[model samples]
Target: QPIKIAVFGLGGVGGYYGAMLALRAAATDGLLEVSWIARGAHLEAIRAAGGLRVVTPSRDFLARPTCVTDNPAEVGTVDYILFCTKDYDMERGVAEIRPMIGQNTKILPLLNGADIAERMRTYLPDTVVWKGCVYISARKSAPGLITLEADRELFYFGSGLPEQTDDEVRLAELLTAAGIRAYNPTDIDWYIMKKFMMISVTATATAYFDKPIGSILTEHEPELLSLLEEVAELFRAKYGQVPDDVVQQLLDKQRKMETLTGYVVREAEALRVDLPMYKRMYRELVS
Candidate 1:
């Protein structure tokens, strides 16, 4: 039998990766089967156009999936589900995809927030869910169009339970064949935290200050570094100790970028964790 997979939520991350997987599956007959779960104008466009159109910096292609549906019952059970929904939509998405899960079905969520897998397991106690994160620069430019600004994609995943190890390995292979750079690290939590640290710090600073990364790094390096240290301290309290050097590495990389980040401070607020710098900046900006 073919290794069945479904990509749920056709947003930027989902659309790009789903298109890639669908294209690969179409090329290799019987090796893999791919389905998509999407809704709204995006769904209608894909069906009418007969495939998804993905445009990257250097190339563009159309991916014809085996099937696309807003309803999960239509796709039936699958070996794996890539839960690529946005952090806010995670709960509803999980509930919606419940019908497509089977005895051996494994879920890998490639979302922004650090606690997504934990939240999923809470909503789905009987299912096997892996902790995972994605590193890419892509966006849905339109209802049915995905744009890949970056030339590369990377995924880090880890099975929360020993029983899911084999499935995790299989997933790595499938993703690799589809042209994704997937890694199954022993310290998946750390990796997730590492990503969380960079995103949260940068996002908070950018959104709070209403400035791009370049301005923040050059004009306010001390403030940016302080925000990172404060966020790292909070992260350590919740997760564990992240090496000082890892934090510094993130700061170094942020110096060369020009992106506007958001959402981390709001999440922190929800937890009642006071990000003084973020909170102050946000207050001044909004007030």
Candidate 2:
């Protein structure tokens, strides 16, 4: 039997992955099946077109899924889910996909936040939830259409997993065959935290300044550095290590929107780490 895979919240991230998988699903014989869970006009367009029109730098093509519906019940239980919904909509997204999950179902969440797996675990106590993040630049241009601003980017998933199960190897193979550059490192925590190290700082700054990246860099570089300091320290407190060039690296990615700083600072507080810069930023926004 094929491993049934469902993509929940088919937007930029989910849409790109699902389109790739759909393109390869038929060639997999009975090894894989791809389904998509979407909503409203986009869902209607997918059904009408019988797939998606994916535009990339090199070429454009149509990719079809085994089934495309807004309801998970249409597909029943699935073996794996590409969890790419907006992190803030997790509660609603989780409830919507309840029908597709089984006790053995594995979810790869490619959303933001370092504690994503922990949060998903709260909703699905028994299912295997993998920590993951995507780097591709893609977006839903219109109903049934996706534009890839860049080719496949480094995709990290399965933190230290399959160190005990065959799941990582199999999933990696599947992802690679579909043209997704997937890597499952034993220390996925390093990869994930390294990412959030950049994301948390940017999100915090944008929300605080009520401005974009360039303005914050030119006018508030000091404030930006302070926020980075807390996050870099937070990473060390949580993981016991920080990269030497981490500051430079974060500046390289500085050119990035996202969750409020409080969401980030709360994680710092959990480790008994203080974020004075974040405190000031919050006060400015709150009052």
Candidate 3:
């Protein structure tokens, strides 16, 4: 039988990964049956264009999903549901998709931040849920066009809170066979959300300063970097300790931005104090 999959939030993350799965399914003997749940302009474009076009930094491809709908009730059952919505949208998205669960269905949330599985466990007590911390960078240009900035699409997933059983292992194997670089880690749940939150806090802080990578590196604002460190510290506080790999990655990203720009720049951190407001709004509106 084919490895059935569904994407709940068909935005940038969902679109890119879902398209990849669909394209692979088309090439293989229907080994991957991918579906999407989307609405509004994005939904309309897929309906009109037949599928979505994913453009990476190096290549462009098209994926024609087997099913696309705004409502989850129409998507039927599947082996997995990749929740790619924003951190804020999880509550509503999960609520909206409650009808799609099956006895053997599992959910892999590919959104930023964390605490999703804990939230989902409240509704679907029978279904298994896994934490999928995605490490790809992509954005939506239009309704049906997803622009992927990175060539690598790695997914770090594992069982946490709900615990990983035999079913989770089999699902991970299926994802590996489908060409997705997946890892089954014991502590993926803790670090995954922390990593995402760190990025959001850092990127949001940098973007809030109107200083892009170039300026931040050249200016050398210790104060700003210190604020970023504070965000990292917050992660440590919540998750107990920061993973050295993730912390190093954050530093590496800063270094890359500086090197690419040919200088160490510094960006202001005026919005660091206002993050709570943003978080509140993000949770309320985007979810």
Candidate 4:
């Protein structure tokens, strides 16, 4: 039987990966079946145009999926469901795709934030949800067109709790065959927390100063380092020890950009975790 995969949310993350899967499915005869879940103008455009158009730095192509629908019931049960919706949409999206989930189904969420897998577990107590993260820069440039901003597209995934299942490896193989760089790491939780810590500080600093990363690093290096230290401390307290050189490594990876750190800060506050630096930066931005 062919492996079935459904991609929920046609935004940058979902669109880019889903398009690649769809394209691969088209090339291989019955090796994989890909379904895309999207709505509004983008859905209409994909339906009318007969495929999704994706533009990367080196190339562009149209991906014709096996099925496209706004309703999850239409797609039925699938082997895998890629949960790529926004952090705020996690609850609603999980509920929306409940019908497509089955006994053997594995739900992989490629979302930001370290606690996303935990949040999903709360909503889906019975489902097998894998902790995963995507390191790619892309965005929806138009209704049905996705633009890849960078060449670095890496996907890391694995189970949080230790298990003997090879589900993550199988999924990684599919993704790799589709031209995506994929890895199933032994320490997925650590990797996820590392990404969370790195992004949290840089994103908070960028938003707080209302300036690009270059300006922040050049003009306010001390403040930036302080924010990084605070987040590093928090990560150590909550998720155990991180590498000593991780802070500088994260700093080196910072780019001229912006992010929704205020939302992340608010989430930390709600968890009763006192992120003083993040809170102060968020307050400054809002007030």
Q: Estimate each model's TM-score.
A: 0.89, 0.89, 0.77, 0.91
| lDDT of every predicted structure (CA atoms) | 0.81, 0.82, 0.69, 0.82
1 against 4, candidate with superior TM-score: 4
In terms of lDDT, which candidate is strongest?
A: 4
The clash tally of candidate 1 reads 0
Q: What is the total number of backbone clashes in candidate 3?
A: 11
Clashing pairs in model 4? none
Model 4 bad stretches (over 4 Å): 255-275
Best by TM-score: 4
Q: How do the residues 153-227 of candidate 1 rate in per-residue lDDT, one tens digit apiece? A: 888888855454777788888888888898888778888878877887777678777889898888888899887
- Residues 21-46 of candidate 2 have per-residue lDDT tens digits of 98899777867899998889999998
How much lDDT does candidate 2 score? Answer: 0.82
Worst 10 residues of 1 by lDDT: 258-267
